[PDB]
RNA sequence: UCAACCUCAUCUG
């Protein structure tokens, strides 16, 4: 639903890494490119964000309960 | 209570044994509101 | 033990409440069993 | 019949990573030095969240399992707080955790994205590693956020929360020579960083006499404590523990006499 | 390597990236226990369930 | 100091 903070298996902290991982695929950037250059190295990191969905900006189109 | 509606999302106060329909909407489904009280939340 | 006669029903046991209990809803109605409800007809059309 | 001395020789030093050799040590004391990095190394992390108001999609238990893996700089006062067990006021205390506030609502039409920076700490030594940010939840407009927290010590034994490093690589024998690893085809196999075998050379000869030694560490710190400090503190609570084990046993022999 | 000992394993060992689902049946929905409890009507045998 | 029965369908080894 939204980006883990720290990855399961390691638990280096993945969570800041989203919004520059999807800014760096706007750039040109291939995804190992965009990974690389967010430092992420072992394949349990780079699976954090390779395999992320966020739907959290599916929730996010619901209006909320109490405006 | 206070019961949010669910379209307008407006606080509305309804007695016990009245209809619920929220005024200035005419909704029908309503909302309990959030309690007062406090729930301690272990980050674990 | 058991004589042919005694075979022909000319009176029907009927079985205790703890055979055929009433089901109960809410205390808002009691249901009856199968069974008291196959016994009322009976009676009906023997009263009949 | 005594321990053997060990000697350290440090490769790099980076904000992130202490990647360091120990020689003339044991399997044993090398392995359990590792794994006291990552389970005994007393750290800072939020273990107690009552929100007061959460209107985001992400519900509250899922808001706090978030903002208890948010690191925090634990570099200097950790060592300064007491556990909360020990403490002698009740609940929490200065003396014991340090409070936190999150009050974010996202009046704004645009998507407030609620960031680590966004909690505020009472004490200044402990921050959530800002000076991205982690991102604990994203606010639509009309969505509010308000929370307190208490952040308490604590080791990654009770809780992964509480792990100071991310990975700790710990390699020995670089190339295979006690055959402790049994390769069935030994040239298929990648060598090592620390590999000083020629190219054409898989595996070097088996050494009858030897022992595990020269062990390789790289250990990368989550940020909440600095790497170095990190490999200090480890060994010092690794001591800490000997020493009370020591204590119990010597009053154990003294009861038995 | 071991993680208790931190020997290697002498037999390399297959590991990778799978993708794996969770199941929704769980303990706890399934642990169950009965002493003395509530009794049918008909049968005045335990109940079901 | 304490709650119905039927029926059907869906899953479990
Ligand atoms: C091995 O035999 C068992 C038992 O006989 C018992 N059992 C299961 N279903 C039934 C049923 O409908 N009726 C009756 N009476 N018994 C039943 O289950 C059988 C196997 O079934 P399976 O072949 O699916 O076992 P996997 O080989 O599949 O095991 P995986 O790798 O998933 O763990
Ligand atoms: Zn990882
Ligand atoms: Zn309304
Ligand atoms: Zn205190």
Redesign the pocket.
């Given at each position: 639903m939204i980006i883990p903070v720290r990855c399961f298996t390691c638990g280096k902290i993945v969570g800041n890494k989203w919004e520059a991982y999807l800014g760096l695929l706007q750039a040109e950037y291939t995804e190992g490119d965009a990974l690389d250059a967010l430092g992420l190295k072992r394949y349990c990191c780079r699976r954090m964000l390779l395999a992320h969905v966020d739907l959290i900006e599916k929730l996010l189109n619901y209006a909320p309960l109490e405006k | 209570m206070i019961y949010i509606c669910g379209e307008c999302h407006t606080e509305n106060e309804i007695k016990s044994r009245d209809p619920i329909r929220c005024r200035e909407c005419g909704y029908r489904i309503m909302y309990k509101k959030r309690t007062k009280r406090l729930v301690v939340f272990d980050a674990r | 033990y058991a004589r042919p006669e005694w075979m022909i029903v000319t009176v029907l046991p009927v079985p205790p409440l703890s055979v055929r209990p009433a089901?109960?809803?809410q205390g808002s109605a009691r249901?009856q069993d199968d069974l008291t409800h196959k016994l009322a007809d009976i009676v009906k059309i023997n009263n009949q | 019949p005594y321990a053997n001395q060990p000697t350290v020789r440090i490769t790099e030093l980076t904000d992130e990573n202490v990647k360091f050799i120990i020689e003339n040590t044991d399997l044993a004391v090398a392995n359990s030095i590792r794994r006291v990095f990552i389970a005994e190394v007393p750290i800072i992390a939020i273990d107690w969240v009552q929100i007061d108001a959460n209107s985001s999609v992400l519900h509250d238990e899922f808001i706090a399992h978030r903002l208890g893996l948010i690191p925090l700089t634990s570099d200097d006062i950790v060592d300064k707080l007491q556990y909360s067990r020990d403490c002698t006021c009740e609940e929490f205390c200065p003396e014991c955790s340090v409070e936190f506030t999150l009050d974010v609502r996202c009046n704004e039409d645009q998507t407030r994205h609620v960031t680590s920076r966004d909690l505020i700490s009472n004490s200044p030594r402990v921050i959530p590693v800002t000076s991205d940010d982690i991102l604990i939840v994203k606010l639509r407009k009309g969505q509010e956020l308000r929370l307190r927290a208490y952040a308490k010590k604590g080791f990654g034994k009770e809780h992964a929360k509480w792990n100071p490093t991310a990975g700790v690589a710990f390699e020995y024998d670089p190339d295979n020579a006690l055959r402790h690893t049994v390769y069935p085809k030994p040239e298929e196999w990648p060598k090592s960083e620390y590999s000083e075998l020629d190219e054409d050379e898989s595996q070097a000869p088996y050494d009858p006499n030897g022992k595990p030694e020269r062990f390789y560490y790289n250990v990368e710190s989550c940020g909440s404590l600095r790497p170095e400090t990190i490999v200090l503190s480890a060994l010092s609570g690794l001591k800490k523990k000997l020493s009370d084990l020591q204590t119990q046993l010597s009053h154990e022999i003294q009861s038995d006499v | 390597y071991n993680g208790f000992t931190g020997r290697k394993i002498t037999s390399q060992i297959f590991i990778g990236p799978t993708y794996y689902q969770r199941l929704?049946?769980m303990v706890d929905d399934k642990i169950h226990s009965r002493a003395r409890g509530?009794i049918?009507?008909?049968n005045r045998q335990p109940?079901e369930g």
């Open positions: - | - | 089901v109960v809803m249901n | - | 929704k049946h509530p049918q009507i008909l109940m």
